[PDB]
Amino acid sequence: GHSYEKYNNWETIEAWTKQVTSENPDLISRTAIGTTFLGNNIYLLKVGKPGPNKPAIFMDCGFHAREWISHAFCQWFVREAVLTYGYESHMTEFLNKLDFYVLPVLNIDGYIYTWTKNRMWRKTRSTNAGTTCIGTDPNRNFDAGWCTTGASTDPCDETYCGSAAESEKETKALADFIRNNLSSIKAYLTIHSYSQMILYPYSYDYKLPENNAELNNLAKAAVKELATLYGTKYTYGPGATTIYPAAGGSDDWAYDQGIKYSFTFELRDKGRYGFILPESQIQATCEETMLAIKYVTNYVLGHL
Numbered sequence: 001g002h003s004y005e006k007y008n009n010w011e012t013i014e015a016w017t018k019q020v021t022s023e024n025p026d027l028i029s030r031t032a033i034g035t036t037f038l039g040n041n042i043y044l045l046k047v048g049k050p051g052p053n054k055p056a057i058f059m060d061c062g063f064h065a066r067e068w069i070s071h072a073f074c075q076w077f078v079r080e081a082v083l084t085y086g087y088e089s090h091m092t093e094f095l096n097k098l099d100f101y102v103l104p105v106l107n108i109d110g111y112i113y114t115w116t117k118n119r120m121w122r123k124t125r126s127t128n129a130g131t132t133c134i135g136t137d138p139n140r141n142f143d144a145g146w147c148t149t150g151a152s153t154d155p156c157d158e159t160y161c162g163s164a165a166e167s168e169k170e171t172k173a174l175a176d177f178i179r180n181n182l183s184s185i186k187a188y189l190t191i192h193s194y195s196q197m198i199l200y201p202y203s204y205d206y207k208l209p210e211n212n213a214e215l216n217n218l219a220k221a222a223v224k225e226l227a228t229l230y231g232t233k234y235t236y237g238p239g240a241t242t243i244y245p246a247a248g249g250s251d252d253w254a255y256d257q258g259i260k261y262s263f264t265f266e267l268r269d270k271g272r273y274g275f276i277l278p279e280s281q282i283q284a285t286c287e288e289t290m291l292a293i294k295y296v297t298n299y300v301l302g303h304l
């Protein structure tokens with residue numbers, strides 16, 4: 001049984017992608033953008049009412065296997081779209097005018113592994129030459145100052161960059177999709193945990209994007225909007241100085257493709273529970289996060 005207020009295993013999320021699509025044909029379609037190392041279909045939901053020449057926002061969750069609140073959030077976003085479409089003015093406008101691509105779990109193989117073997121797994125589950133150590137950090141595997149700062153060359157390490165940029169089937173699949181849809185995708189949102197942040201480029205070097213002032217102001221406003229609900233405090237800014245320098249991330253890569261609004265979200269908490277955020281916090285976390293995501297969406301829609 002699927003529930004939006006619990007963490008759902010992959011079999012359940014997969015079945016949910018099929019069911020939520022079938023139940024909402026005028027709002028949702030489903031495709032597979034590729035397969036994981038283990039051969040699992042990487043599902044993508046396109047959320048929006050059909051219309052001509054629609055811009056798009058792309059959002060993924062579940063890069064990192066143990067960040068279960070991320071996976072829960074993508075599901076919550078779709079929950080909100082289907083529940084409130086027609087009833088609530090902003091969500092209705094968003095879905096009438098834009099498409100949202102929601103990739104509920106990128107690193108499916110790692111997610112399954114966190115359910116079956118090791119709750120604290122981070123990386124993919126692919127093999128590495130010359131060692132029995134498993135996996136690549138998908139957020140160190142993009143062509144963005146690849147494998148320099150904040151990324152490890154050691155396959156046994158948690159920030160292993162991989163054998164080459166896009167070596168992983170999952171990150172190749174994501175990069176291919178974004179490249180193939182570059183003319184329509186106006187914003188890229190990538191959901192992680194924890195530490196309560198809205199981050200924008202750059203992380204791969206200490207340098208700033210040309211629209212730094214715009215991104216800074218937008219992140220600042222989205223943080224303030226998030227805080228209105230429960231008082232949850234987020235920090236914000238360029239990744240390198242706001243969290244740490246780290247190369248090969250998808251946010252920086254997407255920005256360097258020309259996607260001008262590119263954000264990494266770090267959801268709750270600030271370390272009390274860390275990755276093992278209790279299910280009792282799913283609702284509040286997702287509801288406040290919705291406010292920030294909708295704020296960014298409204299900004300994008302209003303500044304085309």
Ligand SMILES: N=C(N)NCCC[C@H](NS(N)(=O)=O)C(=O)O
Pocket residue numbers: 064067139192193194199203204239243245246247248249250251252264
């Ligand atoms: N480093 C880039 N490009 N963006 C920020 C990503 C932050 C993210 N933090 S986490 N979820 O603790 O692993 C990461 O290090 O990949």
Ligand SMILES: [Zn+2]
Pocket residue numbers: 063064067192193
């Ligand atoms: Zn993460």
Ligand SMILES: [Zn+2]
Pocket residue numbers: 080287
């Ligand atoms: Zn709600």
